[PDB]
Amino acid sequence: PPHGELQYLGQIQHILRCGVRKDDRTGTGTLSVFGMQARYSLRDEFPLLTTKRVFWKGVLEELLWFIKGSTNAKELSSKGVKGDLGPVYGFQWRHFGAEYRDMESDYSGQGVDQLQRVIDTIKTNPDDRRIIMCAWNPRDLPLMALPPCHALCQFYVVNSELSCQLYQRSGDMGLGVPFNIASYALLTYMIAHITGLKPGDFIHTLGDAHIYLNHIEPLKIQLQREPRPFPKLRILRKVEKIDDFKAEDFQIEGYNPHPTIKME
């Protein structure tokens, strides 16, 4: 009617032609172009890509683990999904601001719950702009005092529609980008459900978008494939508290993608 994945596939085509090779931190090289925007409509649909299969469970899983605010991977890895680890996403969202030691020390009564606030601001003053929500890459926290956020998701409501816009500092188009999309979208699909709203749009802004050398060919192949009609997620239940969203409370329907694509 248009198509959205087209957006993805499009930039991809762009990356591969006239993107410049550049080597990152690990040392591995990539092709990357600075700055990219994509808008995926979340209205009566779900941007869970079709020109390749996406680990939906892998998404919904991990997501619920962050919202549940746990720093223990086993809390997520205990569902076939990939001595502790550290302050990942499932802590920088809820128990942020309070000194962390381990995972079995209930911070219930600690932290500056970044997520709730958002959920609340939508309930209080939707006409606001500063509905932002930062997040960080653990590897940088002590790496340097006053460490810059890896991402952030400004929210936006109007005409009863919630629409998130994600801005990542760096982008791994290969297997990263496809993931986050359905991820944050899912999140957005949940917030609005508990904030009496209706899903609007997803916008994915990026800083250093890149492709990894050992990823080109498969993607070259991935291009030939043709996007199919997007899914449609259904939250099979009524909730009001973000922390009760149980795993089996979502049902993807209308999802028939092209074969997987093992990327490194």
Binding residues for a second copy (CB under 8 A): 20, 22-25, 32, 34-37, 39, 96-97, 112, 114, 127-130, 132-134, 140, 145-150, 152, 154, 156, 158-159, 163, 165, 167, 169-170, 200-201, 203, 205, 207-208
Tell me whether residue 171 is annotated as binding.
Answer: yes
Q: Residue 52 or residue 94: which is nearer to a second copy going by CB?
A: 94
How many angstroms separate the CA atoms of 194 and 191, rounded?
Answer: 5
At residue 237, what is the residue type?
R
Tell me whether residue 25 is annotated as binding.
Answer: yes
Cβ atoms of 64 and 249 within 8 Å: the answer is: no
Cβ atoms of 260 and 54 within 8 Å: the answer is: no
Cβ atoms of 70 and 63 within 8 Å: the answer is: no
How many angstroms separate the CA atoms of 160 and 178, rounded?
Answer: 27
The CB-of-192 to a second copy minimum distance in angstroms stands at 14
The CB-of-74 to a second copy minimum distance in angstroms stands at 29
The CB-of-51 to a second copy minimum distance in angstroms stands at 23
Q: Residue 133 or residue 187: which is nearer to a second copy going by CB?
A: 133
Residues whose CB is less than 8 angstroms from the CB of residue 49 and which lie 6 or more positions away in sequence, other chains included: 5, 8, 178, 181, 182, 227, 257
Tell me whether residue 210 is annotated as binding.
Answer: yes
Tell me whether residue 170 is annotated as binding.
Answer: yes
Start-to-end CA span in the chain (Å): 34
Q: Residue 5 or residue 201: which is nearer to a second copy going by CB?
A: 201
Q: What is the per-residue burial (b if ≥16 Cβ within 10 Å, else e) of 122-147?
A: beeebeeeebbbebbbbeeeeeeeee
Tell me whether residue 211 is annotated as binding.
Answer: yes
DSSP state at residue 49: -
Residue 58 CA, distance from chain mean position: 12
Tell me whether residue 129 is annotated as binding.
Answer: yes
Residue 104, burial from CB neighbour count under 10 angstroms (0-12, 13-18, 19+) = exposed
Tell me whether residue 95 is annotated as binding.
Answer: no
Alpha helices in 39-172 (DSSP H): 56-67, 74-77, 89-92, 114-124
Picking from 2, 50, 5, the residue whose alpha carbon sits closest to that of residue 202 is 5
The CB-of-136 to a second copy minimum distance in angstroms stands at 10
The CB-of-249 to a second copy minimum distance in angstroms stands at 27
The residue annotated as part of the active site, out of 18, 149, 153, 164, is: 149
Q: Residue 37 or residue 77: which is nearer to a second copy going by CB?
A: 37
Q: Residue 130 or residue 241: which is nearer to a second copy going by CB?
A: 130
153 as an active site residue: the answer is: no
Catalytic residues: 149
Annotated binding site for dUMP: 25, 129-130, 149-150, 169-172, 180, 210-212
Annotated binding site: 25, 129-130, 149-150, 169-172, 180, 210-212
